[PDB]
Amino acid sequence: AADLAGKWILESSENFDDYMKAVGVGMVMRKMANAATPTQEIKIDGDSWSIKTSTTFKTTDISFTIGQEFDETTGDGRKIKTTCKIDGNAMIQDQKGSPDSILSREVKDGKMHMILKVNDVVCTRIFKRV
Ligand SMILES: CCCCCC/C=C\CCCCCCCC(=O)O
């Protein structure tokens, strides 16, 4: 999953609104989130990762070590417990909370494919390298 490193910007999104409804995001925040075109900046050093997700207004930062659970507060304010793993080319972010989510990032054809899963919802957000 080493190629995930660098800076990325949203290029396409499918079913993000349904993902947001499923994790309980309110209408006002969903409208703002759907209207955003975020960047992700990903740094990797060994099993040390950080990811900064930015819009012009609001940023979130997380840092973690592969395999080691950490406390995370999502952009929408949910408190969760997250453990990140590597499965081949993908880094998978297993988020435990109310509800659980699984977020995977994998580079395919030079684009970062992010897949956000909650219940039976599958959201796909594709990012291009900046
Ligand atoms: C992520 C911070 C800016 C938006 C604030 C949170 C709004 C809605 C919750 C979105 C879920 C967070 C996952 C976004 C993944 C991404 O686009 O990179």
Experimental method: X-ray
Q: What separation in Å is there between the alpha carbon of 109 and the centre of ligand 1?
A: 24
Q: How far is residue 118's CA from residue 18's CA, in Å, rounded to a whole number?
A: 9
Cβ(125)–Cβ(9) below 8 Å = no
Give 33 Cα–ligand 1 centroid separation in angstroms: 6
Q: Which atom of ligand 1 is nearest to the CA of 59?
A: 2
Burial pattern 24-63, b for ≥16 Cβ within 10 A else e, equals ebeeeebeebeebebbbbbebeeeebebebbbeeeeeebe
CA–CA separation, 93 and 81 (whole Å): 10
Q: Which residue has the tokens 């990762």?
A: 49
Residue from 59, 101, 56, 57 nearest 78 by CA: 101
Ligand 1 atom 11: residue of nearest CA? 75
Domain spans in the chain, listed from the N-terminal domain onward: 1-130
Count of beta carbons in the 10 Å neighbourhood of residue 73: 11
Among 60, 118, 123, which is best to mutate for testing ligand 1, by the most ligand atoms less than 8 A from CB? 60
| Nearest Cα residue to atom 6 of ligand 1 | 75
How many angstroms is the resolution? 1.9
Q: What is 1-130's CATH number?
A: 2.40.128.20
